[PDB]
Design a protein around this ligand. Structure first.
Ligand SMILES: CN(C)CCOP(=O)(O)OP(=O)(O)O
Ligand SMILES: CN(C)CCOP(=O)(O)OP(=O)(O)O
Ligand SMILES: [Mg+2]
Ligand SMILES: [Mg+2]
Ligand SMILES: [Mn+2]
Ligand SMILES: [Mn+2]
Lengths: 176, 180
């Protein structure tokens, strides 16, 4: 797997091996973030495995990843949903298309991404990949937002930034 | 380091090497939990290092540990504060002396402890021990308690149980006053 490096205008300029790509000096690359809900409308919150190179052991939104060259954002979501959580989903819908951020994790590992955000509903049960996910919780979105508003540091920085975007949050309130 | 083993009534019976003692088969032993506030009245929340045997990478109250043989619970609190956090404190106050709990962590390691809970004020800068603590936040208690009520699964179980105890909570509230 690779990440796709981006320039100022946001044009792909090349690739890097994914693990190799996330360092103390991570360069701008393409990513996605996804928020998964079940048929009943609960939000799936996950806890990244301890072996993750960036933000290991951190609570965060359902699934995030790195689109590969020539891959649509929607397919990346579907691929990573299957891969990390072994779950099938409805066609991902856009909730925050211009999200972009840079952040540093407690060990100094940086994420620097153009990171469009999507939402979808699961259509099958989870089958956890414990290389990616060490724990998860099916929750009411309202409580998760309250938790995010009260103690944002208990969650991944990008999850917090997405959920506090006025529009994203409105859009998330529709899967409930 | 060792833990002090206890029976049902909470009577010491002996000691055990610490790492050795914390397994999927943890016996009742003595411990402590402490909630630390700065002069401003903010609560120190910490994140356990990734290398901890139990609940690594989890957010939790300021400092916990295991008193050693010949050691008072309060002295143990002072030592761990120093060891984990580099920080000097005011004499620890008892806020939940009969807290006891058993809990299984995400990889199956058991804590089974008689764990009196204290609160204190820090009187020096922090000097985080990255061997023990991977991250921290200085917070408003109210925010913390709201977080714990909204998403209790995002914190250590003992933080949650202590925080929801009526009496403990009242006493933590007393440490939010600014104090010169
Ligand atoms: C929101 N950004 C961090 C996307 C990060 O996704 P991951 O960290 O899960 O990358 P990957 O899942 O591909 O390992
Ligand atoms: C509240 N319990 C967990 C006390 C044990 O906390 P620790 O994990 O800090 O034990 P130790 O600090 O001795 O390693
Ligand atoms: Mg991922
Ligand atoms: Mg400790
Ligand atoms: Mn990335
Ligand atoms: Mn113990």
């Amino acid at each position: 797997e690779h990440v796709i490096l981006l320039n100022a205008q946001g044009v792909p300029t090349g690739t890097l091996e994914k693990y190799a790509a996330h360092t103390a000096d991570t360069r701008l690359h393409l990513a996605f973030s996804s928020w998964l809900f079940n048929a009943k409308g609960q939000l799936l919150v996950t806890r990244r495995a301890l072996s993750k190179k960036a933000w290991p052991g951190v609570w965060t939104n359902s699934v995030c990843g790195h689109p590969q060259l020539g891959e649509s954002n929607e397919d990346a979501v579907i691929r990573r949903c299957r891969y990390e959580l072994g779950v099938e989903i409805t066609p991902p819908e856009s909730i925050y298309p211009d999200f972009r951020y840079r952040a540093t994790d407690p060990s100094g590992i940086v994420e620097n991404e153009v990171c469009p955000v999507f939402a979808a509903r699961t259509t099958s049960a989870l089958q956890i990949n414990d290389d990616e996910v060490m724990d998860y919780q099916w929750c009411d979105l309202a409580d998760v937002l309250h938790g995010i508003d009260a103690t944002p540091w208990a969650f991944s920085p990008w999850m917090v930034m997405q959920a506090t975007n006025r529009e994203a949050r409105k859009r998330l309130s529709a899967f409930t």
